[PDB]
Amino acid sequence: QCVNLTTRTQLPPAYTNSFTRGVYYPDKVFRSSVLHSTQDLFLPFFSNVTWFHAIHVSGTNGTKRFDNPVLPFNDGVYFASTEKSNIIRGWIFGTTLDSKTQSLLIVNNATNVVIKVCEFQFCNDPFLGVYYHKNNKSWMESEFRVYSSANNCTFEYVSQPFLMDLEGKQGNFKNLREFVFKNIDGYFKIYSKHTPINLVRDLPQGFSALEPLVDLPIGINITRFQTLLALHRSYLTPGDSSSGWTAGAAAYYVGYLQPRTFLLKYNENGTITDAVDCALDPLSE
Amino acid sequence: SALGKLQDVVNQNAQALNTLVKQLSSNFGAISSVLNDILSRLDPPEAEV
Amino acid sequence: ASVYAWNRKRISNCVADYSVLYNSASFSTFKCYGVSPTKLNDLCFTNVYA
Amino acid sequence: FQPTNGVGYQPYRVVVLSFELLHAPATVCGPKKSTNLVKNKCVNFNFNGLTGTGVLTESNKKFLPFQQFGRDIADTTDAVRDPQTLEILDITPCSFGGV
Ligand SMILES: *[C@@H]1O[C@H](CO)[C@@H](O)[C@H](O)[C@H]1NC(C)=O
Ligand SMILES: *[C@@H]1O[C@H](CO)[C@@H](O)[C@H](O)[C@H]1NC(C)=O
Ligand SMILES: *[C@@H]1O[C@H](CO)[C@@H](O)[C@H](O)[C@H]1NC(C)=O
Ligand SMILES: *[C@@H]1O[C@H](CO)[C@@H](O)[C@H](O)[C@H]1NC(C)=O
Ligand SMILES: *[C@@H]1O[C@H](CO)[C@@H](O)[C@H](O)[C@H]1NC(C)=O
Ligand SMILES: *[C@@H]1O[C@H](CO)[C@@H](O)[C@H](O)[C@H]1NC(C)=O
Ligand SMILES: *[C@@H]1O[C@H](CO)[C@@H](O)[C@H](O)[C@H]1NC(C)=O
């Protein structure tokens, strides 16, 4: 069900600064009140990341900003999305995305999460579909035109079914989801952290320690990835499969990790409460 | 900051002990630092070396 | 399945307990080829075709 | 498969179980054994890959839900969580000294 979307103007992306974020637990070792100094892949402090926009307001005279470019994957991605209506709904990590090599498919659709590893023939603009009704007032996930064909697969994974909100709430953003995707030694270790937020603009300041989530042994050569957003096709916008789709309101930040030394500070329970950089300023060094 | 020397002596002793302890996790030109893995995953001559 | 339509049963991500096959009394042939059936409890594999 | 033929013209359901090693990390393997929890004695322990020698007391160091091992300011093994039961132990070498 590949369909090339239209009515989407171009605009240079913005760049928001990351205020001391992107510190995860390097290992599974317990330390209480220890100023341990580790060396691993992290995000440099006070470094600005690309701010991809996704909004559709009446002020926008036909822009329909729906960004999902095929971003590179050097060593890691500090994926952080400020959603309020659950727009960011999966990732399409891969290597070639032309039905020749395998690609890690992590998509949390309406029922549950399906971490599938198979050879897929992806389209040029993958997305999900949620259709709104005026009779029973229920948002339903209908379109699943991510890929077009399957092949001989490999280790997959499913989970128990559940139901999310799926409602276009109004107001500022109320959730923040951080992720770190590293891939070394055939291990796609994923970190996660969910903290509340009451902001409507660029990533807030603070500090959080991302905990390990999954260590799927997939063994791929992922070097280029993309995002999986979702539209809001409703009764308002008319047209066809190519024109007449809404975009809601969301935004996701994408950063890149670099090898640099960090000085961690473990608390009296085992949770990292503060950390300092080594190569930022003379006082930091 | 009145008893500086009494604290400095203890600090130097603690640093010396910490360095002596940390000098056990060095390769010193060998394959690894753990002796049992060296004597298990290697032939007798190179293990003894 | 049939002889010309042999369906494979590729299975992974499990704990294979081989101590139930040869400790049975309902087979006729157990001619393993160079796998040491009594030693399969200490060898790890990636995929097990069936 | 008429039920009147000999012993050489009957169905024989044959399985062709095979094994092979790829470049991906192994995810299917055989089972493992476990011994009893003999504490308060200088014994040799091997839980999940680490070795050592010393008594295994029952301390109160609370680990994180995902953390498994435990060290100190000297970067040495001090407390390992039991795999079977979620009980944080404590590793301390037994008596040693001069006479
Ligand atoms: C979308 O455009 C690309 C490039 O022009 C083309 O290869 C692809 O076939 C198009 N999609 C469909 C569904 O035709
Ligand atoms: C933002 O990052 C980009 C990286 O290409 C670059 O323009 C510069 O480092 C930053 N600019 C500003 C204004 O923060
Ligand atoms: C969500 O994905 C699961 C797994 O493939 C599938 O069984 C289910 O039908 C999907 N739900 C929707 C609404 O597409
Ligand atoms: C809601 O209404 C739509 C539009 O007729 C219909 O397709 C759908 O089945 C309805 N769902 C329920 C649960 O009534
Ligand atoms: C899947 O099929 C392709 C082409 O037939 C083959 O090269 C590959 O080894 C198969 N197995 C995989 C990708 O695990
Ligand atoms: C550490 O854990 C103890 C035990 O519950 C708790 O009382 C204390 O507040 C914790 N320290 C924090 C959260 O900084
Ligand atoms: C393992 O089994 C024992 C009983 O045989 C039980 O007490 C223990 O809780 C089990 N461990 C886990 C992690 O389920």
Swiss-Prot record, chain D:
Start and end residues of each stretch annotated as Disordered: 23-45
Annotated phenotype, changing Q2R: In strain: Omicron/BA.1, Omicron/BA.2, Omicron/BA.2.12.1, Omicron/BA.2.75, Omicron/BA.4, Omicron/BA.5, Omicron/BQ.1.1, Omicron/XBB.1.5, Omicron/EG.5.1
Disulfide bonding pattern of the chain: C42-C94
Function per UniProt: Attaches the virion to the cell membrane by interacting with host receptor, initiating the infection. The major receptor is host ACE2. When S2/S2' has been cleaved, binding to the receptor triggers direct fusion at the cell membrane. When S2/S2' has not been cleaved, binding to the receptor results in internalization of the virus by endocytosis using host TFRC and GRM2 and leading to fusion of the virion membrane with the host endosomal membrane. Alternatively, may use NRP1/NRP2 and integrin as entry receptors.
Binding partners and assembly: Binds to host ACE2. RBD also interacts with the N-linked glycan on 'Asn-90' of ACE2. Cleavage of S generates a polybasic C-terminal sequence on S1 that binds to host Neuropilin-1 (NRP1) and Neuropilin-2 (NRP2) receptors. Interacts with host integrin alpha-5/beta-1 (ITGA5:ITGB1) and with ACE2 in complex with integrin alpha-5/beta-1 (ITGA5:ITGB1). May interact via cytoplasmic c-terminus with M protein. May interact (via N-terminus) with host bilirubin and biliverdin, thereby preventing antibody binding to the SARS-CoV-2 spike NTD via an allosteric mechanism.
Protein name: Spike protein S1
